[PDB]
Amino acid sequence: EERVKKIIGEQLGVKQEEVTNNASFVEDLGADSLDTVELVMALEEEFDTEIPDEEAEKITTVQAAIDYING
Amino acid sequence: IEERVKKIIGEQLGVKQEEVTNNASFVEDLGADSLDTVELVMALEEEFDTEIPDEEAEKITTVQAAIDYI
Amino acid sequence: ASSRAQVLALYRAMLRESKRFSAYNYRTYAVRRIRDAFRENKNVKDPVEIQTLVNKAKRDLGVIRRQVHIGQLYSTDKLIIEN
Amino acid sequence: SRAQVLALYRAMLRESKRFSAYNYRTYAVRRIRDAFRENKNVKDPVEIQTLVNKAKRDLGVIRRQVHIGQLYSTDKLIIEN
Amino acid sequence: MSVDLSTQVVDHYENPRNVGSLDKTSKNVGTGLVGAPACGDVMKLQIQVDEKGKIVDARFKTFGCGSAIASSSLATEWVKGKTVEEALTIKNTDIAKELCLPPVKLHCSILAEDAIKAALADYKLKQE
Amino acid sequence: LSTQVVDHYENPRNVGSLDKTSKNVGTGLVGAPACGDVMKLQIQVDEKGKIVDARFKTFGCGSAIASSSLATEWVKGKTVEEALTIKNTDIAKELCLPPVKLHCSILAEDAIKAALADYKLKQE
Amino acid sequence: SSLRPLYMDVQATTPLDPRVLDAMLPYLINYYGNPHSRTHAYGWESEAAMERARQQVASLIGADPREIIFTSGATESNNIAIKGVARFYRSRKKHLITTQTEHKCVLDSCRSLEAEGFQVTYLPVQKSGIIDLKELEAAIQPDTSLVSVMTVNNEIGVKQPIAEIGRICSSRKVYFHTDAAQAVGKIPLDVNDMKIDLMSISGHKIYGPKGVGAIYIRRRPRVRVEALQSGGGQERGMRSGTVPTPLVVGLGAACEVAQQEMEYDHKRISKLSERLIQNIMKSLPDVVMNGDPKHHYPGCINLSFAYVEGESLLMALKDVALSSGSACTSASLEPSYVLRAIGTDEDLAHSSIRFGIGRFTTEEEVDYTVEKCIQHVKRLREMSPLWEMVQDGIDLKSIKW
Amino acid sequence: SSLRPLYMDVQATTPLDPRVLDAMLPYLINYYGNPHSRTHAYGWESEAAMERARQQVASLIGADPREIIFTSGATESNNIAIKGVARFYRSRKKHLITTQTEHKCVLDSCRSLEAEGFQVTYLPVQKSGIIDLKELEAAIQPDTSLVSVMTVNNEIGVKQPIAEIGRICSSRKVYFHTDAAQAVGKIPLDVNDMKIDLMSISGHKIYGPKGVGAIYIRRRPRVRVEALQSGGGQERGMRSGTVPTPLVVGLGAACEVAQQEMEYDHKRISKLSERLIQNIMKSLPDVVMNGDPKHHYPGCINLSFAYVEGESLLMALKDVALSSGSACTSASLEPSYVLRAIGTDEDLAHSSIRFGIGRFTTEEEVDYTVEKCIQHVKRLREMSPLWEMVQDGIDLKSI
Ligand SMILES: *P(=O)(O)OCC(C)(C)[C@@H](O)C(=O)NCCC(=O)NCCSC(=O)CCCCCCCCCCC
Ligand SMILES: *Cc1c(COP(=O)(O)O)cnc(C)c1O
Ligand SMILES: *Cc1c(COP(=O)(O)O)cnc(C)c1O
Ligand SMILES: [Zn+2]
Ligand SMILES: [Zn+2]
């Protein structure tokens, strides 16, 4: 369903419990900017979308990603 | 220098400009075969920078038809 | 029952694709040889030999497509007579 | 800048992942990653501009070679299953 | 999927037939272990014969190329329920024909033949 | 291939011929041995010993053509004694001739001196 | 970054036929296996392509595939023929016969053999450029090991009477080799009809890839050759080294295509050649064609423009890629030995240029080249002292150094 | 299931690096001029590209561009070095020195020279595959003109002590040639630091195109070499013939890329090699590595699997392209002379296969190869009579 959380952990190698909806990739999950790029690309491959750079720029939290991956 | 497709047609079929009446037929009137007509319609696509698609192009057999389409 | 129509599209395609060659020599040679070839075989009546020529023309159509594409990828200046 | 840099990274990854060949694809992706990460902490702007320009040339090469591989593809590897 | 590698050889390799070993102590089994010269291809072939001279089963183990393994397996299939004298008629050329072996791999067939003859010699030698 | 050579190539100055019968015209017709580079250079001398104009025609490579054009341009308005100081090495330096083409410069110098020699021979 | 000039120098090299590049690319991308790898699929597919190409060459020249050896080019091929045949029979035969217009690789190989104690006769040619068969017969010696004569001249295009030479050599039990680099794919060649024993083939002369060639070594009445490149024994032991798969694949594609289009190419190339020559001659006097037009390949036209130096004309035609046998423009200032062989006056030897008409040449290129040729020959003639003297009727008496 | 198998045979040849092909195509399409045509623009641009590539190669090996001669491959280069040097100085020197593990082109060139009246010393190697320097010094004679030793072996991957050999040869006024086909672009090479006089380079060993190579001929002290290919004198008269522009362009691109990526490639290649070896050794006993691992290039791993014949194993791994030095795999049935030279028992010589790890090999490829290798080696051992006897012990078995 919204198992993007799984993906996030796979991308960041963090326990499924540590992908809190209110979590920030950099502030909380220890990712750099590159990790974030590879993350949004992994979501592009998993959900068959093309969230443009101007749209990707706003994806900084898990709940934001879940939200976007609904439309 | 307007709908001078006649020039193009004349160049392709090598007929005098006077024999390019709007009522002229490529095969019946201007002595062209089917291949010559293919190269002709392509020549119009290249001259007017268009892509008269196949489903529409199939019906272009007269000068007035060519003028009409554009 | 004539394959005439199948031929014609092929002709059209083979000319159109050939006309995209970036290089003067390849473009001119391809177009002229396509024309002269179709015209030379216009009077063939044997359906099997005709199908043979059609299949060969299809292989050459794929070749022309790939080579025109590559020639676009590595294009260069036009010839002095091009302008 | 910085955003331009990241845009470059994304572009080179997206284009690289289209390689038809397993060896070319995997190699391209991994080398791009290791390269950007290896240069992550460089500070000299001139060397940075150099690396960026090199990355642009390598991006054009990646595009052209990916297209070539698409025009002349073949069967996949046994390990792709 | 190959070149000068016949399909029959591939069948006798990927699907080795009569692979195994018997008890050399049963006095009713003749075991011949002969190896090839130039190409260290070694063949171990054991045959088991009940009374009346008929081969009741055959097993082998071979250290060698695919053509040697397949040649030996084919040997065991051929050395099925034939006369101990019948086995004397097995010729290397029949094997090479059966498998379409090129000249470079004939060392296999000549070895397989040898193995058969090595086994028969031990059996007769087992009858004091 | 230097740019100066290209400029004198077809942009050559003073291409033509003069009247060989004039006692005031010196005509030098020199051919090279190694190849077939031939140079004809004619000069016209005023009463004061100044070269008032010169014309040439040369059958040879581009570097020889340019060498001769530069030669006639240089002898523009100089003294018959002044012109003797024109050196082939000055020509090759002016044109940046590579070593393979120095025979052109040597031919131009040779032509100049032969033509001046013809003039002096006509005054007697 | 200005516009590019027309290519009229097909005798030096030819562009790749896009079909050939398409034939090569799969092996430059995905099929990179070594054809000598016998233990996996990459080798199997590479070998398959190589052998297919071999059959293609054999089909073009009418030989058995087993008689085709892949090389790096026509130069290596001629080296193998001359040095291999020469050395093999050295114990009993030390005389060779070739001609003075042969390519520089044949001549220089023969020169090295002379430095090694061999005897070599360089047959002269008639003013037409064609050898005299009688001098060939009378020149053959009992200890003659090899006769080498090129099929088509690379500078003037004259065709030698290959078939009759084959008959002569056969009747004398002498090996016959032909440098066919400029003929393969342009004129019909059959080794058996022509009694040919060895033949040289260049890949980049027939719109194939650079860096690959072939040598035909007859296997029927077997021909013995000493291998020059030592190694692992590839190519029946005649040419050790890794067979360059993509290059030979391209070579085969080129030979096959040439077999398909040979007649058509000859028709239109001949038309363009006649057009160029006839149009230039009708507008410029004292222009002489070098080589007999009765036995001449139309794709190579060598013309001398009397009273005009070659390199000056080339510089005039900065928009057309050409070549000349002029002393000038040659590293060691040296006139073409080919033109000296046909007895060309020194002036015309310095006044010759070579036009190449090829598979891809257009009529427009021909007309442009003709116009510029007329214009600039006129301009240079108004600049030429020899022209002036001829128009005045002077006497050849220049002064030298 | 017509899927293609993994490539683990980088020592036989390597794919084009897309960078090299991109470097080549313009000269296969638009820039088709002959580099020896001096009178028009097509020739000029071809020559320009060719000379630039030359600077690329020289830059990779630290030589002067004038010291790089283009050839058709490493075979032609080795022929030029050995036969050329040997012939030039024949009037006063007729002894050559090489080793028993050199490539067949060096060996056969030396053989032809033997047929030409030269005497040739084939140095043996230690079981490690490394020559013994003392035997090299002691082997040189007053009329020794040339020493030939390859840098890295193509069958076992051992690295020879190039620098010390250079010192010795230099101190004796003897020419030093090295077949560097297996080292260029994989391990560091500097011609001057190593006192090298001639070196062979092959394009298709370093992700370049097939059909092109180079020979480095020193100009500093100068080395005299007799040209083998007669012709018009191209390449300073050493190698007549039309230089194949696209091929030399690709070779140069390959050399530049190799200079860029050599360190990275060595790091990950070495890590993967250690992975393969350690993982195979822990799961299959009686597997022996041929060649000293202390002086060894990780890209070439030659292993003998006791009690198993090589070609049967190769056929078992129908999903991996490999190689073996087993007699039962050569046209003329012949076991690898390299393995025989390093003293490997003949039986284990028949049990060797070669894994090559290259610039593009993935860790997944390594793990797959390891797993299938274990599985099929076990299966074949249960089929092997030598296995059975070893578990029970025994000696001969007639021939
Ligand atoms: P963000 O979280 O702040 O990330 C930090 C970044 C890198 C974005 C930025 O802030 C930063 O730290 N910059 C310092 C250094 C830098 O920006 N370097 C960028 C250029 S690195 C480079 O050169 C890439 C290497 C390209 C080679 C790839 C070759 C692939 C193989 C080709 C196959 C055909
Ligand atoms: C062009 C040519 C050659 C050149 O051969 P390559 O090895 O391909 O460069 C040889 N002989 C003749 C007659 C040629 O015209
Ligand atoms: C592969 C190899 C060669 C082969 O050279 P080619 O370029 O194929 O002619 C020669 N020597 C060594 C050591 C090699 O590994
Ligand atoms: Zn075997
Ligand atoms: Zn000159």
Numbering used by the authors:
A (entry chain C): 4 to 74
B (entry chain G): 3 to 72
C (entry chain F): 3 to 85
D (entry chain B): 5 to 85
E (entry chain D): 6 to 133
F (entry chain H): 10 to 133
G (entry chain E): 54 to 454
H (entry chain A): 54 to 452
Tell me what the authors wrote about this structure, in their words.
Biogenesis involves the de novo synthesis of a Fe/S cluster on the scaffold protein ISCU, trafficking of the cluster via transient association to various targeting factors, and finally cluster insertion into specific recipient apoproteins. A critical initial step in Fe/S cluster synthesis is the supply of sulfur by the cysteine desulfurase NFS1. Here, we report crystal and solution structures of human NFS1 in association with ISD11-ACP, ISCU, FDX2, and FXN, together forming the ‘core ISC complex’. We show that eukaryote-specific ISD11 binds to NFS1 distal from the desulfurase active site and does not directly participate in catalysis.
